[PDB]
Structure 1
Amino acid sequence: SMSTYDEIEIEDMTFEPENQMFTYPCPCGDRFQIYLDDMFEGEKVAVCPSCSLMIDVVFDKEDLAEYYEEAGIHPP
Structure 2
Amino acid sequence: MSTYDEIEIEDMTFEPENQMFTYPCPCGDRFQIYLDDMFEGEKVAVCPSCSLMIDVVFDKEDLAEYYEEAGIHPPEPIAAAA
Bin the TM-score by the shorter chain.
0.7 to 0.9
Instruction: Spell out, residue by residue over 1:3-43, the C-alpha distance to the aligned partner (whole angstroms, 9 max, x if none).
Output: 22521100001111112010002243531101111101111
CA contact (8 A) 1:18 1:74 kept: no
Q: How many residues align?
A: 75
Q: Which has the higher contact order (CA 8 A, sep 6+)?
A: 1
* Residue 53 of structure 1: how far off its partner (Å): 1.3
Q: Distance in 1 between matches of 2:74 and 2:17?
A: 9
Q: TM-score, normalised by structure 1?
A: 0.80
Identity %: 100
Q: Distance in 1 between matches of 2:72 and 2:20?
A: 15
Q: Distance in 2 between matches of 1:42 and 1:74?
A: 18
- Higher CA-based Rg: 2
Structure 2 residue runs without a partner (length 5+): 76-82
3-state SS of paired residue (1:69): helix
**Aligned Cα RMSD in Å?**
3.5
CA contact (8 A) 2:20 2:32 kept: yes
